[PDB]
């Protein structure tokens, strides 16, 4: 059979706030100079030195609209030729933005804890973003819904490519909470929820690319607790499928690592 | 100090890994291809690093020949002095799932055999839930892997308290390592140690430098964790916030961005 399709998740490189631990959501920070170099080196490793990715197999790249994610795309793809890039579709999708932190934008965890405490919250148990979301920001159900929509579009593309006998690596450039969340629901963590409310059923028009079919969900997944994942800035994870079957989504424990050939 | 890590390594190709034949107690060697595969893996992680020999404290291995051969081939890039500073422990708690009647079979053959025996009329066989006829239950494998995890995490806690980096490697098998990873970061269910077998010390290893951890509860799965790990594959388990009490799965496996 053709190579099993994969979804390659890439967290953006260093910004001024990723370094301090400040929560970076809608704030449109650029990469730091260090962060730029970090992503240049990451591209060189995956394409040139280690060949963990083959440009010929990359079909689509989906990115968050945030500058830091878009910069990361360009830096990671630098080792490619213009012809190789010409064969890869890049799609900006608002469904891949970071968790909307609301009141907590730019804060550290310990500051958020103290602010919530001062507001009379968390008297029974600690704040847990995965369960509780953020004041004046997104609930966990809101982020689960939109990530589920993006997953469905990606998996639909994979099914089509597989049916054509085509390898298909699809890359997703986004953010730390969103990507851990995305990985978690990909392989079936959390709970399934039927799409019933207006928000659950609506098409928010999060991307403009008519080559990517919209998938109207019947159900979605969301988390209610911490999936207990690590993913550094610049980190790369891999989501794929068991038994060459799009209906068996799975997490690749090796991330992008494969044994060298021969 | 660097947050400790547990680096899991599935053994290289055997004749049965290639074909999909379930390989448990059967003590197959690596194929020629599998030997080269593990040599190249060691050369990639150390030479071409994702691992630093100076930070490796312990290597635990399954007793199976294929796992032990994989240890030796992956460590080839080290010097004798680097190897002299690493403890290698054989632990029976890290053996593959005991497949019983299904040893050497393909999944499709297992399904047909079970069907012929009147099984799986309501729902398909699921090893993670059901285990194997005349082999291990899911609780049995969860218990022994839990024991090994407890020992490893105890070593990590000690090393961290000494201000020492500690990568601990675990060389084992496909079902066992996927299971190990799942329970590391909290999948499955907790079960109190109650029965004779749940409470016993089975003396699975002989290395007095590794404290035994007597469990009062363990963790086991009841369903498929939905992981992939190919022969020769390397995964990474660690902790959030430098805290041994926050075990976590590293989504990047062994990959890290090259340093500046």
Curated annotation (Swiss-Prot), chain A:
Role this protein plays: Sedoheptulose 1,7-bisphosphatase involved in riboneogenesis. Dephosphorylates sedoheptulose 1,7-bisphosphate (SBP), which is converted via the non-oxidative pentose phosphate pathway to ribose-5-phosphate. Has a fructose 1,6-bisphosphatase activity in vitro, but this is probably not biologically relevant, since deletion does not affect fructose 1,6-biphosphate (FBP) levels.
Listed name of the protein: Sedoheptulose 1,7-bisphosphatase
Subcellular location: Cytoplasm; Nucleus
Reported effect, residue 101 to A: Impairs catalytic activity
Keyword Hydrolase in annotation: yes
Pfam families xref list: His_Phos_1
EC number: 3.1.3.37
Gene: SHB17
Effect of residue 175 to A: Impairs catalytic activity
Residues with site note (Transition state stabilizer): 175
């Amino acid at each position: 059979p053709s190579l099993t399709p994969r979804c390659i998740i890439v967290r953006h490189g260093q910004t001024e706030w990723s370094k301090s631990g400040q929560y970076t959501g809608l704030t449109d920070l650029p990469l730091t100079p260090y962060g730029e170099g970090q992503m240049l080196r990451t591209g060189e490793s995956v394409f040139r030195n280690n060949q963990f990715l083959n440009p010929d197999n990359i079909t689509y790249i989906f990115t968050s609209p945030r500058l830091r994610a878009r910069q990361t795309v360009d830096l990671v793809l630098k080792p490619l030729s213009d012809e190789q890039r010409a064969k890869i579709r890049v799609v900006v999708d608002d469904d891949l933005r970071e968790w909307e932190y609301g009141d907590y934008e730019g804060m550290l965890t310990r500051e958020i804890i103290e602010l919530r405490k001062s507001r009379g919250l968390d008297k029974e148990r600690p704040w847990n973003i995965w369960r509780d979301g953020c004041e004046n920001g997104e609930t966990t159900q809101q982020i689960g819904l939109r990530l589920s929509r993006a997953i469905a579009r990606i998996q639909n593309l994979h099914r089509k490519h597989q049916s054509e006998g085509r390898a298909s690596d699809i890359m997703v450039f986004a953010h730390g909470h969103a990507l851990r969340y995305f990985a978690a629901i990909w392989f079936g963590l959390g709970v399934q929820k039927k799409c019933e409310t207006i928000e659950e059923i609506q098409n928010v028009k999060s991307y403009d690319d008519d080559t990517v079919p919209y998938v109207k969900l019947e159900s979605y997944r969301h988390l209610v607790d911490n999936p207990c994942f690590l993913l550094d800035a610049g980190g790369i994870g891999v989501l794929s499928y068991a038994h060459h079957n799009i209906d068996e989504p799975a997490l690749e424990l090796a991330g992008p690592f494969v044994s060298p050939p021969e």
